[PDB]
Amino acid sequence: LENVDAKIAKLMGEGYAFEEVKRALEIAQNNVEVARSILREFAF
């Protein structure tokens, strides 16, 4: 219902690895905009 697999796939497409994206969406409580900010901020 929340669109988790689609949200994982979308953020993976922005250049992030599966485990990072999964973990960021968890932290963000499935908010794509917030997970994206996490991924950008803490990229290495």
Chain residues in the site for other proteins (CB under 8 A) = 4-6, 8-10, 12-13, 18, 22
Going by the DSSP 8-state scheme, the letter that residue 30 receives in this structure is: T
1: Cα separation from own chain's centroid:
17
Which residue, 10 or 32, is less far from other proteins as judged by CB?
Answer: 10
Q: Which amino acid is at 40?
A: R
- The single-letter DSSP state of residue 19 is H
Provide, rounded to whole angstroms, the least separation between the CB of residue 41 and other proteins. 21
Q: Closest CB to other proteins among 22 and 31?
A: 22
Q: How far is the CB of 13 from other proteins (least distance, A)?
A: 5
8, two tokens: 């994982």
